[PDB]
Design an enzyme around this catalytic site. Structure first.
Site, PDB file in Angstrom:
ATOM      1  N   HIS A   1       0.797  -0.899  -0.150  1.00 23.60           N
ATOM      2  CA  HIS A   1      -0.029   0.156   0.049  1.00 23.60           C
ATOM      3  C   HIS A   1       1.080   1.442  -0.112  1.00 23.60           C
ATOM      4  O   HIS A   1       0.445   2.116  -0.217  1.00 23.60           O
ATOM      5  CB  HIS A   1      -0.756   0.136   1.193  1.00 23.60           C
ATOM      6  CG  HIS A   1      -1.269   0.220   2.771  1.00 23.60           C
ATOM      7  ND1 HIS A   1      -0.334  -0.012   3.633  1.00 23.60           N
ATOM      8  CD2 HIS A   1      -0.379   1.832   2.998  1.00 23.60           C
ATOM      9  CE1 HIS A   1      -0.014  -0.222   4.607  1.00 23.60           C
ATOM     10  NE2 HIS A   1      -0.029   1.894   4.350  1.00 23.60           N
TER      11      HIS A   1
ATOM     12  N   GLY B   1       2.542   6.107   8.824  1.00 20.60           N
ATOM     13  CA  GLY B   1       3.716   7.076   8.780  1.00 20.60           C
ATOM     14  C   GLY B   1       4.618   5.937   8.812  1.00 20.60           C
ATOM     15  O   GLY B   1       5.763   5.483   8.576  1.00 20.60           O
TER      16      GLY B   1
ATOM     17  N   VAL C   1      18.159  15.863   9.772  1.00 21.43           N
ATOM     18  CA  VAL C   1      20.041  16.574   9.302  1.00 21.43           C
ATOM     19  C   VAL C   1      20.726  15.683   9.009  1.00 21.43           C
ATOM     20  O   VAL C   1      20.668  14.210   8.663  1.00 21.43           O
ATOM     21  CB  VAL C   1      20.059  17.235  11.247  1.00 21.43           C
ATOM     22  CG1 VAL C   1      20.280  18.393  12.010  1.00 21.43           C
ATOM     23  CG2 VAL C   1      20.441  15.285  12.458  1.00 21.43           C
TER      24      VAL C   1
ATOM     25  N   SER D   1       4.047   2.926   8.345  1.00 18.08           N
ATOM     26  CA  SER D   1       4.056   1.731   7.389  1.00 18.08           C
ATOM     27  C   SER D   1       4.907   0.857   6.640  1.00 18.08           C
ATOM     28  O   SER D   1       5.732   1.983   6.096  1.00 18.08           O
ATOM     29  CB  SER D   1       2.467   1.980   6.254  1.00 18.08           C
ATOM     30  OG  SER D   1       1.223   2.474   7.448  1.00 18.08           O
ATOM     31  N   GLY D   2       5.026  -0.131   6.862  1.00 17.81           N
ATOM     32  CA  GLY D   2       6.094  -0.877   5.817  1.00 17.81           C
ATOM     33  C   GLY D   2       7.219  -1.379   6.384  1.00 17.81           C
ATOM     34  O   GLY D   2       7.539  -1.729   6.183  1.00 17.81           O
TER      35      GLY D   2
ATOM     36  N   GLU E   1      19.951   6.327   8.426  1.00 17.17           N
ATOM     37  CA  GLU E   1      19.174   7.124   9.349  1.00 17.17           C
ATOM     38  C   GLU E   1      18.602   6.850  10.513  1.00 17.17           C
ATOM     39  O   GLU E   1      18.323   5.942  11.177  1.00 17.17           O
ATOM     40  CB  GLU E   1      18.025   8.092   7.960  1.00 17.17           C
ATOM     41  CG  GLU E   1      18.937   8.203   6.999  1.00 17.17           C
ATOM     42  CD  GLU E   1      17.403   9.373   6.997  1.00 17.17           C
ATOM     43  OE1 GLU E   1      16.484   8.647   5.852  1.00 17.17           O
ATOM     44  OE2 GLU E   1      18.170  10.620   6.757  1.00 17.17           O
TER      45      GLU E   1
ATOM     46  N   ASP F   1      -0.450  -7.301   2.452  1.00 15.87           N
ATOM     47  CA  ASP F   1       0.374  -6.217   1.445  1.00 15.87           C
ATOM     48  C   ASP F   1       1.790  -6.042   2.308  1.00 15.87           C
ATOM     49  O   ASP F   1       2.158  -6.037   2.983  1.00 15.87           O
ATOM     50  CB  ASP F   1      -0.591  -5.237   2.940  1.00 15.87           C
ATOM     51  CG  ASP F   1      -0.053  -3.584   3.016  1.00 15.87           C
ATOM     52  OD1 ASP F   1       0.415  -3.707   2.025  1.00 15.87           O
ATOM     53  OD2 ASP F   1      -0.284  -3.091   3.468  1.00 15.87           O
TER      54      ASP F   1
ATOM     55  N   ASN G   1      17.978  10.311  12.753  1.00 15.56           N
ATOM     56  CA  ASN G   1      17.711  11.628  12.353  1.00 15.56           C
ATOM     57  C   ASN G   1      17.503  12.082  11.354  1.00 15.56           C
ATOM     58  O   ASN G   1      18.171  12.373  10.884  1.00 15.56           O
ATOM     59  CB  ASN G   1      18.664  12.680  13.528  1.00 15.56           C
ATOM     60  CG  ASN G   1      17.575  13.808  13.790  1.00 15.56           C
ATOM     61  OD1 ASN G   1      16.882  14.338  12.849  1.00 15.56           O
ATOM     62  ND2 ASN G   1      17.389  14.606  14.871  1.00 15.56           N
TER      63      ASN G   1
ATOM     64  N   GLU H   1      24.081   7.667   6.340  1.00 10.32           N
ATOM     65  CA  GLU H   1      23.587   7.610   4.976  1.00 10.32           C
ATOM     66  C   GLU H   1      23.807   7.290   3.718  1.00 10.32           C
ATOM     67  O   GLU H   1      24.291   7.948   3.474  1.00 10.32           O
ATOM     68  CB  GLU H   1      22.117   9.136   4.717  1.00 10.32           C
ATOM     69  CG  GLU H   1      22.132   9.710   5.847  1.00 10.32           C
ATOM     70  CD  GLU H   1      22.731  11.291   6.596  1.00 10.32           C
ATOM     71  OE1 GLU H   1      24.177  11.006   6.474  1.00 10.32           O
ATOM     72  OE2 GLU H   1      22.542  11.771   7.411  1.00 10.32           O
TER      73      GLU H   1
HETATM   74 CA   LIG Z   1      19.993  11.963   8.461  1.00 13.61          CA
END
Ligand SMILES: [Ca+2]
Lengths: 223, 223, 223, 223
Positions: C40, C175, C57, C177-178, C52, C84, C54, C62
């Site tokens: 979905h 948020g 910033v 989700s997944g 990640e 799903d 945070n 990353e």
């Molecule tokens: Ca970051």
């Protein structure tokens, strides 16, 4: 619609279907050029279908018209579906006749106990996917805020009301979203949300259209 | 509570007692780790007691959980008791069960005339001091702003509402402060202040919790 | 995540974010070139963000990698969210290190009562929109089929399980989700849906990954 | 189809209608259990209607089979419609005969000038919403890459070809999407997009099926 009946040919001729892309929602015609639906059915380009009762076959009465403007309520909140209402302006006016009519906007808010009709092509069951080709109808009362708030504690805003049956068995369902709840000739609700369909103590929740009378007027007058 | 009754074992199970040896204020459990009470009940270390409606007869019913954070409203004013609300974070989650449950935060304000329930272990009398071991309950309506403002001219802010009886006789009282006013399964008021208890034309004044839904949500989310 | 805590530096290093347009979903790294998430959350082009903690910033840890293939389960049902699950192939391999690692696929389905960890940057509140900057973690148990089915009558398929607390107070949320539910180092669930967040008798519902082990292997071999 | 003719009875017996209540896209039968259509026509549950040229009459020849798997091309891009192709697996095999047959997959790419046949139940007008009950056919040539690219600068990828008439007047249109362009007994194209319908210098753009012979073959063999 769960536990409803097929609408008579002459009933519910204000009913629109929206092809919001490939998603389906109902809607209702309030003037020859404007349709109201639920903001959670939004897409920037929608084709509105009118004059239809059996969507699987041709009946000669159908009118397919594309949107030119789609206006979600400014404060629509997808987290809790507060202000779940949107207006669609048609690129050309619908030809009103027996099968395509408008429904009136509410003059005031309806009170609990008012009997109303909801209609749609949504799911017929709350435990399986069964979708109809003919439009279904359901008579149901508006429930009290005491009932509504106790069924969904902390989730019901001032822009929502519950309608249906606390014993369950009869309810709107998925696919009916955006469709009309009409009480004494006026559009009082837009099918919005619920937990499952037709479960006990979980009645449907509808956008309270009488709270948007100014917004709908203003928007139509200047768009 | 003046003029109420002993609470039924199932009602008011969201009731908390704020203690530091003595129990000095009430509160209510809105989640397994958060209690809301009145800011004028502030102490920096609070033991929260949850359990049985009779605070004397213990038989492992009770749970005593210490506070790890106590957050008064940033604009609480002790001269007029504006914004008289506080949140207490429990150092461990409460065991929710037949004795201990949560109350929901309101998504809409309640209207005048809604009937609600206040509860607490405060003073039973408007003349003497006599305190119960068993939690008391009182059913009371929200009064209109005009009655409230008539009763306390120049002393009601928009963060306050009156509830109770203008004839007197039944009211919350000293020791009930911080306690819940629940209307249709939702926390609508916190017991805050009044002139005496159960006097004619001096109803109880309560913190209007629906004005704080965003501050409560943000403070719980961020701490 | 409602009622959780900020994940330690080194935990949940299998966590990915998908910037699927303006939709954000969680996901998890299962090889240096494949991510698992919820169908979905589908968008034709997805930027996968790894390493990640945070998200607001720059951190120096990353890896931002674009998808090259996005494969929803062949029988995903958008109406009831059955099946799903979705696999995303990265356009180049991620460099694995302390901040970016893979999670093992399940050797068997976990039983009720297994303790697991769910993580994500979704909503912190069940009563407002409050999104975090730092990754949140929550320890939760897998619930019995009977609890799940009584929480969601008529809606739970064999490809779903409930995890969390029937009492409410702690849950995943919009948020998340997944994102990953990991029990003893194996990916057992994908955050899929729920009614509200952290409400009583409405735990999160999760995609049952142990049902898809051969599909995931076959898809990864053929693509 | 704008400017076509009603297909002869044996013509286009590989034609499928994809339905969800109403017809929304076309497709074509490539084996007794597989259908190819366009990925932009995706719905997670599709009923495939085969065997009858009049979409509104249940006259006899018709097979209605539900999808069990719907597989979009893994690198489909909804933005520019690159790789606009999808395979649908049927739950029951279709019975093949004079009214329902399969179309051969391409063994090489068709060149410019090859005359082909498009078919569908799409819009009959490029200025009005006008939909037929009987299947329309249109004979049209594949256009050169140069004509295609000067008609749509920077929007044609290697997975697309133009076909039709640069003078306009004849074209496929909305509702024909997903339907077949067959040349010399082999499926060469899938109706994908165009600017308007039957406009001058705006021919139809079709998915180039000969680029997917291996993908269709492996996908059918592993699902
Ligand atoms: Ca970051």
């Amino acid at each position: 619609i769960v536990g409803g009946y097929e609408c008579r040919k002459n009933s519910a001729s204000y009913q629109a279907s929206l092809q919001s892309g490939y998603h389906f929602c109902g809607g209702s015609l309030i003037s020859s050029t404007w349709v109201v639906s639920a903001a959670h059915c939004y897409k920037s380009r929608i084709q509105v279908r009118l004059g239809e009762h059996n969507i699987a076959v041709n009946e000669g009465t159908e009118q397919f018209i594309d949107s030119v403007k789609v206006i979600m309520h400014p404060s629509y909140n997808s987290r809790n579906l507060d202000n779940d209402i949107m207006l669609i302006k048609l690129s050309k006016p619908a030809s009103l006749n027996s099968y395509v009519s408008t429904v009136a906007l509410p003059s005031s808010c309806a009170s609990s106990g008012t009997r109303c009709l909801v209609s749609g092509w949504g799911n017929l069951s709350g435990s399986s996917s069964n979708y109809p080709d003919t439009l279904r109808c359901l008579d149901l009362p508006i429930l009290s805020s005491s009932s509504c708030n106790s069924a969904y504690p902390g989730q019901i805003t001032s822009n929502m009301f519950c309608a249906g049956f606390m014993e369950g068995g009869k309810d709107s369902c998925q696919g009916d979203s955006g469709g009309p709840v009409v009480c004494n000739g006026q559009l009082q609700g837009v099918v919005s949300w619920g937990y499952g369909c037709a479960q006990r103590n979980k009645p449907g929740v509808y956008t309270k259209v009488c709270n948007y009378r100014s917004w709908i007027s203003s928007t139509m007058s200047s768009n």
